[PDB]
Design a protein around this ligand. Structure first.
Ligand code: AU4
Ligand code: CA
Ligand code: CA
Length: 279
């Protein structure tokens, strides 16, 4: 399959070179996989999700995404137009308030929730969790991410947006999950992207067009936008049977575009997520 005039990020993950505008992907499109987006919620009624999204848990008064961030991330995972895995199903877990903030205890609860909840869902091709959030180092936040990964879920987390070593941020600093840095359309490390030896992979993160609340769309930037590209790609690869939840981060790194990125500090991986699609 091919999507013409795709958002640049989608094109980039299906090309060995920057500058292309077509997203090439297998028609299976992540069907049979499930991705939990742990964030400010998801506007499930957005036409772009085609009824494939639903809220399963909130830690606040409502399950509504009153912010937009969660809906944007979910759109990059699995919306029709802006999504990597266009037939996956999406589950929203609202651990962040409508200001985009949340306490560590709530975030931890949301991760434990997913580890249990996945046992009540029909996801024959596997389960992914996308965490576009983070804060200062916390061993208990890292431990919750490690548990989620251990339980059989492919955990993708944002590196953070402080142009600093991700070792001082959580859950980015948890080695057992897949920590994702951001790149721009010219194959440079995004100016805000964290870096460091704990990074596993880079994905498109600068000027990412996706779904927004009120049935709208907008372009925003962050390692928050890179993470759902990798989460979507994981779901896509699991559906194809190329990898499992336990080994998906390693498979993505193994099959990545290598050495294409500029402005990568010594000690940080030069690896950009790539779907290896061959028609
Ligand atoms: C410091 N830390 C762990 C962290 C910081 C920022 C973010 C992030 N999602 C973010 C930060 C800034 C902005 N802007 C627009 C300033 C957007 C997203 C995530 C983690
Ligand atoms: Ca290349
Ligand atoms: Ca890792």
């Amino acid at each position: 399959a091919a999507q013409t005039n795709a958002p640049w990020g989608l094109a980039r993950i299906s090309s060995t070179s920057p500058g292309t505008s077509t997203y090439y992907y297998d028609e299976s499109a992540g069907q049979g996989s499930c991705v939990y987006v742990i964030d400010t919620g998801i506007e499930a009624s957005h036409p772009e999700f085609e009824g494939r999204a639903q809220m399963v848990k909130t830690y606040y008064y409502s399950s509504r995404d009153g912010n937009g961030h969660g809906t944007h991330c979910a759109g990059t995972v699995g919306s029709r137009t802006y999504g990597v895995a266009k037939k996956t199903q999406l589950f929203g877990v609202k651990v962040l308030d409508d200001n985009g903030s949340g306490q560590y205890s709530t975030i931890i609860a949301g991760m434990d929730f997913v580890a249990s909840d996945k046992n009540n869902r029909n996801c024959p091709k596997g389960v992914v969790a996308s965490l576009s959030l983070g804060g200062g180092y916390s061993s208990s936040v890292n431990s919750a991410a490690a548990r989620l990964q251990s339980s059989g879920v492919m955990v993708a987390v944002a590196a953070g947006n402080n142009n600093a070593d991700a070792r001082n941020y959580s859950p980015a600093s948890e080695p057992s999950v897949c920590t994702v840095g951001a790149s721009d359309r010219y194959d440079r490390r995004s100016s805000f992207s964290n870096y460091g030896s704990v990074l596993d992979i880079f994905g498109p993160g600068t000027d990412i067009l996706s779904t927004w609340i009120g049935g709208s769309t907008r372009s925003i930037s962050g390692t928050s936008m890179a993470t759902p590209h990798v989460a979507g790609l994981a779901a896509y690869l699991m559906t194809l049977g190329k990898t499992t939840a336990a080994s998906a981060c390693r498979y993505i790194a193994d099959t990545a575009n290598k050495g294409d990125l500029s402005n990568i500090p010594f000690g940080t991986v030069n690896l950009l997520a790539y779907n290896n699609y061959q028609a």
